[PDB]
């Protein structure tokens, strides 16, 4: 129950403090003992929640970024009934680099809510995006395999898509959350909204997250913890640390 009292302390101090109202998320920061192996790129790997949802694709504004020609992409995703109301805007990379420059990029950041791009263009994406999006780790775009078809060696790649599959993929990544792999010991992960759900949801959230990150299997995503997790601190971006689970 000490965890829950500390969460009560955090949320009530969030109510009183003028700065703490103006940032509206909760981050769990973990310190373990050992440094982690994989170098820090910027592919946010996802983490599942089992009992509690977090956000809705029918609740956030979405940007999609394509391959080059984007014609069948835009028209099919617009016209075929599973994604007709989903994405705010679809645009290709070349069209983006032509269209937005500097202050226009900052206006994009101010306006749009969550960004997803094709896997085959994520590697180049942050260079046209710059580092205003790449301040820290909130608005990191994800990557989505569009066609449910795989390119073998020495064979021409087939173009297709399906709104079915892309809608399921967005509903997964918007239901549950994502973390970033590092090299140093300390790490951070966004968990939950202060009003969208409550303290039991947050505790169950933390339990499932630490369980999925402790589990030995599912290794490309969930085997991130090496050594023992020392402690978990709950904090906002502008609040302070509250210590739980110290051993």
């Amino acid at each position: 129950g000490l965890a829950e009292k500390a969460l009560k302390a955090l949320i009530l101090q969030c109510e009183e403090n003028p700065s703490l109202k103006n940032d509206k998320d909760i981050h769990i920061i973990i310190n373990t003992g050992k440094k982690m192996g994989i170098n820090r790129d910027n592919i946010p790997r996802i983490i599942p929640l089992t009992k509690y949802k977090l956000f809705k694709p029918r609740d956030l504004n979405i940007l999609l970024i394509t391959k080059d020609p984007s014609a069948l992409y835009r028209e099919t995703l617009t016209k075929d009934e599973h994604t007709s109301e989903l994405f705010k805007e679809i645009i290709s990379v070349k069209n983006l680099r032509r269209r937005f420059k500097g202050s226009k990029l900052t206006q994009l950041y101010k306006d749009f809510d969550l960004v997803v791009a094709d896997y085959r263009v994520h590697h180049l994406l942050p260079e046209v995006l710059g580092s205003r999006f790449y301040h820290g780790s909130k608005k990191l775009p994800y990557m989505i395999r569009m066609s449910k078809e795989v390119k073998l060696k020495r064979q021409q790649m087939v173009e297709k898509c399906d709104p079915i599959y892309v809608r399921a993929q967005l509903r997964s990544i918007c239901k549950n959350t994502s973390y970033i792999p590092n090299n140093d010991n300390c790490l951070s992960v966004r968990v939950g909204y202060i009003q969208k759900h409550s303290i039991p949801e947050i505790l169950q959230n933390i339990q499932d997250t630490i369980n999925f990150l402790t589990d030995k299997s599912k290794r490309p995503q969930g085997g991130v913890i090496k050594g023992g997790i020392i402690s978990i601190f709950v904090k906002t971006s502008n609040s302070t640390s509250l210590p739980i689970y110290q051993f």
């Binding site: 009292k5 302390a9 302070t240 640390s241 509250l242 210590p243």
Partner: peptide, 17 residues
């Protein structure tokens, strides 16, 4: 009444070092 005591801990830790 937890927040003030833990920020107390932060301050006193640093000045103790």
């Amino acid at each position: 009444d937890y927040y003030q005591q833990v920020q107390r801990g932060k301050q006193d830790k640093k000045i103790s070092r």
